[PDB]
């Protein structure tokens, strides 16, 4: 009875916290248009349907979003996959050349300024002997003045040759389902009120994650995942300021964004099999790209998040908002890609408020660069191809990214300011629910049995 | 609907309960442990790490007495210096996650003793068939 022997059970449900690689899998809707239409049409397997999202009881696991893995590898995965869709495309060695620029035909003012430069330049032909003269349109943010006449040059030519993206491939987001290989599991917190740090009381395992689309944006992340009922703020340590503050709200704010100008693309043959898609002529009115949001929905959704923010700071606290403090371009504004073209849109028009402790719309104007320098890589740029026609897109603003000003000296006002900074804080808004554990079977246990001879 | 009783037979469904759930589910976790251009290289090395990890465990059962029984039983007595507990309280009051930490301060003492006991039993069995 008390002469207990031991038995080793194999296959015992028990795990540890570990770190491993994952495996992407994309849905069948992205395979209906094929042959390098978007990236990772070949890099991912097609999905199995409807993973075994089953439940688990009497169970409690502490999570973390901040020292979590699988976001640290995804920022490497998307960059490493982003580089692969460029190397089959054209280099721009023959185009870093002297430019002869002038103003576009427009009623120009003395104080205010134009934003398009009509530039002509020498260029090679398919043949090597002959040359040609050809012209295009460019933005103010891509030419600098080399130093009567006034001749320009491109901006990135003193640091790196540039890669034109092929116009066949698209940059639109697609669903990506990560999956764990054999011998691992993915747990998912299913709690309602859960700030992302600390023990979740109702976990549920799953085979693969749900729909995770990759977007790119610094402030005001787009097409995100909605909150369940309330509006939730999340942070690592709110009394600290150097960490960002993720704000995820419930009712999505619809945002319209457009460029009303009408383009024309114009192919220039550089050599054999080379095609520089320059901008042709602009038909109609030279107008500025802009975005609209609704006034009342925004005044409401700030009223929700102030009610949520006052829980951590005392009820008697002045909360106000301000424009971004400064820096480079694509962290003061907010950026996004709208059907193959990148915007940079001033957002002073939203964060001009204060909040006491008791038909119209908002327009906000944008700028358009053509070359990007994403992830601030030392040997990289990307000339984007211009696209035809009047362009617009509709999106759901879903979360904010904030930063407190950490001032000393006896403050009741606790001002907040937007800021993008790292790209990973986009991603942590998506993978905060999951974690990866490693099954270790073959437990061992005393019981009352003895193996005979 | 699918009901409550289906997740009792799901993968890792018995993890939250006591051993009585885990006394019957052991085929499922054993089943899902195996079956699963530079991306092909990374997933290929993940797959071979998975099967190498499996085959280490089949080897480590092979050097013990139980080859593929999946419910072993063997011949070292349980030293009560570790447990210090009554019988059914580790059969009805505890979970396997809870059982993990109480035997995590010490390990491979048990794995050291099992190899020695099986090697000794094979020696005495070789003597028994040697006189036979």
């Amino acid at each position, epitope marked *: 009875a008390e002469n207990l022997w031991v038995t080793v059970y194999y296959g015992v449900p028990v795990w540890k916290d570990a770190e491993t690689t994952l495996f992407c899998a994309s849905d069948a809707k992205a395979y209906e248009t094929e042959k390098h239409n978007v990236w990772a049409t070949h890099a991912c397997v097609p999905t199995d349907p409807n993973p075994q*999202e089953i439940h688990l009881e009497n169970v409690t696991e502490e999570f973390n979003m901040w020292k979590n893995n699988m976001v640290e590898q995804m920022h490497t995965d998307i960059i490493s996959l982003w580089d692969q869709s460029l190397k089959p495309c054209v280099k721009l060695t023959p185009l870093c050349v002297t430019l002869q620029c002038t103003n576009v035909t427009n009623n120009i003012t003395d104080d205010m300024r134009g934003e398009l430069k009509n530039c002509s330049f020498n260029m090679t032909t398919e043949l090597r002997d002959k040359k040609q003269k050809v012209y295009s349109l460019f933005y103010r943010l891509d030419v600098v003045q080399i130093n009567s006449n006034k001749e320009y040059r491109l901006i990135n030519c003193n640091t790196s040759a540039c890669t034109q993206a092929c116009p066949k491939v698209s940059f639109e987001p697609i669903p990506i389902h990560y999956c764990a290989p054999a011998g691992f599991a993915i747990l998912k917190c299913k709690d309602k009120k859960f700030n992302g740090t600390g023990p979740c009381p109702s976990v549920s395992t799953v085979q693969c994650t749900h729909g995770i689309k990759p977007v790119v944006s610094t402030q005001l992340l787009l097409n995100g995942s909605l909150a369940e009922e309330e509006v939730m703020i999340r942070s690592e340590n709110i009394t600290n300021n150097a960490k960002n503050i993720l704000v995820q709200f419930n009712t999505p704010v619809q945002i319209n964004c457009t460029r009303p100008n009408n383009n024309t693309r114009k192919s220039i043959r550089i050599g054999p099999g080379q095609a520089f898609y320059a901008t042709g002529d602009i038909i109609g009115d030279i107008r500025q790209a802009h975005c609209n949001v609704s006034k009342a929905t925004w005044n409401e959704t700030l009223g929700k998040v102030v009610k949520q923010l006052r829980k951590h700071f005392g009820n008697n606290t002045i909360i106000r908002f301000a424009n971004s403090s400064g820096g480079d371009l694509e962290v003061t504004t907010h950026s996004f890609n709208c059907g193959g073209e990148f915007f940079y849109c001033n957002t002073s028009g939203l964060f001009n408020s204060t909040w006491i402790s008791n038909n119209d719309s908002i327009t906000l104007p944008c700028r358009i660069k053509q070359i990007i320098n994403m992830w601030q890589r030392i040997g990289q740029c990307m000339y984007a191809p211009p696209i035809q026609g009047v362009i617009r897109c509709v999106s759901n603003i879903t979360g904010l990214i904030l930063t407190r000003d950490g001032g000393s000296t006896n403050s009741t006002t606790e001002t907040f300011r937007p800021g993008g900074g790292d790209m990973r804080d986009n991603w942590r808004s998506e993978l905060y629910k999951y974690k990866v554990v490693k099954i270790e079977p073959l437990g061992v246990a005393p019981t009352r049995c003895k193996r005979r001879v | 609907a*699918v009901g*409550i*009783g289906a997740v009792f037979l799901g993968f890792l469904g018995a993890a939250g309960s006591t051993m009585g759930a885990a006394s019957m589910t052991l085929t499922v976790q054993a089943r899902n442990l195996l079956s699963g251009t530079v991306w092909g290289i990374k997933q290929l090395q993940a797959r071979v790490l998975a099967v190498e990890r499996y085959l280490r465990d089949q080897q480590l059962l092979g050097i013990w007495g139980c080859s593929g029984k999946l419910i072993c039983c063997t011949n070292v007595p349980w030293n009560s210096s570790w447990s210090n507990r009554n019988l059914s309280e580790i059969w009805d009051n505890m979970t396997w996650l809870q059982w993990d930490k109480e035997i995590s301060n010490y390990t491979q003492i048990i794995y050291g003793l099992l190899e020695e006991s099986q090697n000794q039993q094979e020696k005495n069995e070789q003597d028994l068939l040697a006189l036979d």
Partner: antibody
Amino acid sequence: QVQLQQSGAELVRPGASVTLSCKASGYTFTDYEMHWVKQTPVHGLEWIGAIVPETGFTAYTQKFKGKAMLTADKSSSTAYMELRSLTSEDSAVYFCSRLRLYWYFDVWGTGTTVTVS
Amino acid sequence: GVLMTQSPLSLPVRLGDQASISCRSSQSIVYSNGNTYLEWYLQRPGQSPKLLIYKVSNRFSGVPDRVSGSGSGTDFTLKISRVEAEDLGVYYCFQGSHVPYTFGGGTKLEI
């Protein structure tokens, strides 16, 4: 015979603990599931959870885990509740019921009115 | 949670006309094999709630040929072609994909 003979109307003083009884009949308990659904005028139909009576495999929601208990006696062939910390919102109408695995609700009982007063 | 959002609640429906009671879920209710398990309830004041449909479309045994469910993903609408006095009262939605299941708020058919 296929019935859910429940308990009676219960005018319960607050702070008390209620043992409900769902005498199901028509089949064995070992075949199929047992379930409990509330009825409040605030929400409509609410939840308690579910029980499997062969082993005692229980599940609940987040709202009532740690509040209610589900026990099943295999010999007496009854069901049980063990409520704790009865509140004014808990005054409801309880419907015992049955599911099969991968099927629907066969039987629906009378509904025990448990008022907390 | 996976709480259902019923639209609309109150429908005073004259006798002989049609009725449409939609639910919208927070997530997809796709069960892990392909067969979603949706259910629609009855309720009269003084009767236990009982089932009309146990699928997207396939119905409880004994239910007449006037009630039909349809929809996809999140949006799932009940449609009654001819409304009688038995149809009056509270209807609900129900999920079967993964536990814990959530009822709605209750949609009353009136006259």
